[PDB]
Amino acid sequence: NHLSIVTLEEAPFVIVEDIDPETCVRNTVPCRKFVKINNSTNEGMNVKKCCKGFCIDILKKLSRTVKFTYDLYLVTNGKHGKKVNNVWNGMIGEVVYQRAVMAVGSLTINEERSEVVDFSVPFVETGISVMVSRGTQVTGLSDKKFQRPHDYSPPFRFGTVPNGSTERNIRNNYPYMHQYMTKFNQKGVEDALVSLKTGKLDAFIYDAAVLNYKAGRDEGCKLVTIGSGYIFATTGYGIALQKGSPWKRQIDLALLQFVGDGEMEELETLWLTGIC
Amino acid sequence: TRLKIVTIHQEPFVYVKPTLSDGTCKEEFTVNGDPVKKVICTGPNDTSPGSPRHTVPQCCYGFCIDLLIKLARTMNFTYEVHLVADGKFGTQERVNKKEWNGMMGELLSGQADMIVAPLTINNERAQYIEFSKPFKYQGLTILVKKGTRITGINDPRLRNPSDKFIYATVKQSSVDIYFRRQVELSTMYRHMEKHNYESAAEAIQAVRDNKLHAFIWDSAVLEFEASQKCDLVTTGELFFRSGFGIGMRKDSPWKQNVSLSILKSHENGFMEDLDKTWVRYQ
Numbered sequence A: 001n002h003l004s005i006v007t008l009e010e011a012p013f014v015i016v017e018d019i020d021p022e023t024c025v026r027n028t029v030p031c032r033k034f035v036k037i038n039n040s041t042n043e044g045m046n047v048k049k050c051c052k053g054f055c056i057d058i059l060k061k062l063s064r065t066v067k068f069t070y071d072l073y074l075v076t077n078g079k080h081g082k083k084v085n086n087v088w089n090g091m092i093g094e095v096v097y098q099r100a101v102m103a104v105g106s107l108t109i110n111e112e113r114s115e116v117v118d119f120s121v122p123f124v125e126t127g128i129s130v131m132v133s134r135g136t137q138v139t140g141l142s143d144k145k146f147q148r149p150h151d152y153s154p155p156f157r158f159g160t161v162p163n164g165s166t167e168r169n170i171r172n173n174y175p176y177m178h179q180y181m182t183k184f185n186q187k188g189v190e191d192a193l194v195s196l197k198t199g200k201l202d203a204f205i206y207d208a209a210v211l212n213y214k215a216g217r218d219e220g221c222k223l224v225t226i227g228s229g230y231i232f233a234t235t236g237y238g239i240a241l242q243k244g245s246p247w248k249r250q251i252d253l254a255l256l257q258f259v260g261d262g263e264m265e266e267l268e269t270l271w272l273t274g275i276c
Numbered sequence B: 001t002r003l004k005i006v007t008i009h010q011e012p013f014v015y016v017k018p019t020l021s022d023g024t025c026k027e028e029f030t031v032n033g034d035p036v037k038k039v040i041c042t043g044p045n046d047t048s049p050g051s052p053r054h055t056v057p058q059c060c061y062g063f064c065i066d067l068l069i070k071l072a073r074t075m076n077f078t079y080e081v082h083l084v085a086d087g088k089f090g091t092q093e094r095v096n097k098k099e100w101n102g103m104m105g106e107l108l109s110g111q112a113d114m115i116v117a118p119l120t121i122n123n124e125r126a127q128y129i130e131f132s133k134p135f136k137y138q139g140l141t142i143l144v145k146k147g148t149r150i151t152g153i154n155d156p157r158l159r160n161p162s163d164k165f166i167y168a169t170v171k172q173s174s175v176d177i178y179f180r181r182q183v184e185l186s187t188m189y190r191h192m193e194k195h196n197y198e199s200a201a202e203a204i205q206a207v208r209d210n211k212l213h214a215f216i217w218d219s220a221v222l223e224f225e226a227s228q229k230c231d232l233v234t235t236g237e238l239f240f241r242s243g244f245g246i247g248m249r250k251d252s253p254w255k256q257n258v259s260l261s262i263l264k265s266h267e268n269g270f271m272e273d274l275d276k277t278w279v280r281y282q
């Protein structure tokens, strides 16, 4: 009944804040982040932090509907999840190696992750989108500018944030495009957005849900997703649970009840709506 | 194993056609010049409620049939396709005792082993069956005749109805149970329950014939219909998001691999190919 839950900061899904002077107030819940003392030790401290957002509100509703208590912590071993030397890091790894009962966040459902963890029903539609400056002509992922980049002089500058589900898919589907674009690897979303606006990058390939959120709140509506905010390889965010977890049935029914009761639309209205 | 697959007529997911004289299917080419893979499906001919149902061999093809063939060859299984006898998607209706109808009924009673159709994932169905991860993400929209001025779901001609502007959905479908169980949608359900149609095709026909002023249904179907008939349009975008999944019994040994095949198909473009073939053209 008292479950260990892992999460990761990715606004507006999960937003991390400092504790107020002296705990977590209002729409926020307590989360803990293990912070190292130094790099010549394995010692660290669990800093009390506060968490909010679309995914945190889902966790609150699940907590009262499914009837469970939880201790929320933030992943420090990588991010979302990557299989390095046949070993999983990130939120996926925390669930695979049973350090967490479940993973809640902007966690993309894909085939390789579904072989090692169980995912709930999707609760946010996502996949791959392309963010460009308004007016940029790119048909889609299959555009020659992306597919055969060196046919263009100068070539089109495009990148992603590596080690997530987006880079994985690109690696598997477009080997040549992938090896060319690693030169334009971005540290995070904020870095990528700055790079686009200042003309240092032409396209940013990333998670459809985060890209459409950022496009909607962009100052001057300069940055757009290609097509009608088109999604390639459509999937969803889901709750990762352990294989054969006794929690799945009740988690899926509760999420589907929130969809049917109108609660999901209220969450989309608070957290996800934008101007553009 | 030899899986009994149940499906429903629903363009462009499942086209249903009579066989030729010799019980075979006429050869056809897609919009891209590739041959159309057709299957023999058995189903009733007469669609009149409360009448005897005479089952006949028919030809089935479409987005969902190509998906069936892909799943069958990926997981190495054989199948027999049949059309749902009552021609319904499936809802649980009160008879204290509540019973399932449609494809849902056929799956739970053992008449079918699997649902391969545009079947919406919802709380009600998920309590009794296993759904795969969605093979299509979409939602609800409204179809009207070109010229009919309607804003969308919050339009006064739907929110505050009269007999002057008639709107409806398909009986015993997920749209029908969505309006029934949502207290905010109560006034709309009260209007719709006197006008609901037996099938999506009859409702689409009624909108063309000016008998139905608005049809509330799945966007994957309505956007396709509007892209084919110039006298029809959809109004607004989606007012509610939903997805289609494959349906199996909770004891099925195919559950894990059905979902992995679906995820694989979205990731490698097979799902995008199906949309290029059956959904997005004109």
Ligand SMILES: O=C(NCc1cccnc1)c1ccc(CNS(=O)(=O)c2ccc(F)cc2)cc1
Binding pocket: A121, A122, A123, A124, A125, A126, A236, A256, A259, A264, A265, A268, A272, B121, B134, B137, B138, B241, B242, B243, B244
């Ligand atoms: O409204 C839903 N989520 C909010 C949201 C906000 C922004 C983008 N996408 C979704 C929702 C969740 C689950 C289902 C039912 N399951 S599903 O897998 O068929 C599905 C269909 C469409 C979705 F957008 C998400 C999941 C339906 C709706």
Ligand SMILES: N[C@@H](CCC(=O)O)C(=O)O
Binding pocket: A080, A081, A106, A107, A108, A161, A163, A164, A165, A166, A167, A206, A207
């Ligand atoms: N939602 C993604 C984030 C990164 C990406 O878009 O590749 C994941 O779970 O990997």
Ligand SMILES: [Ca+2]
Binding pocket: B001, B113, B252, B253
């Ligand atoms: Ca079986």
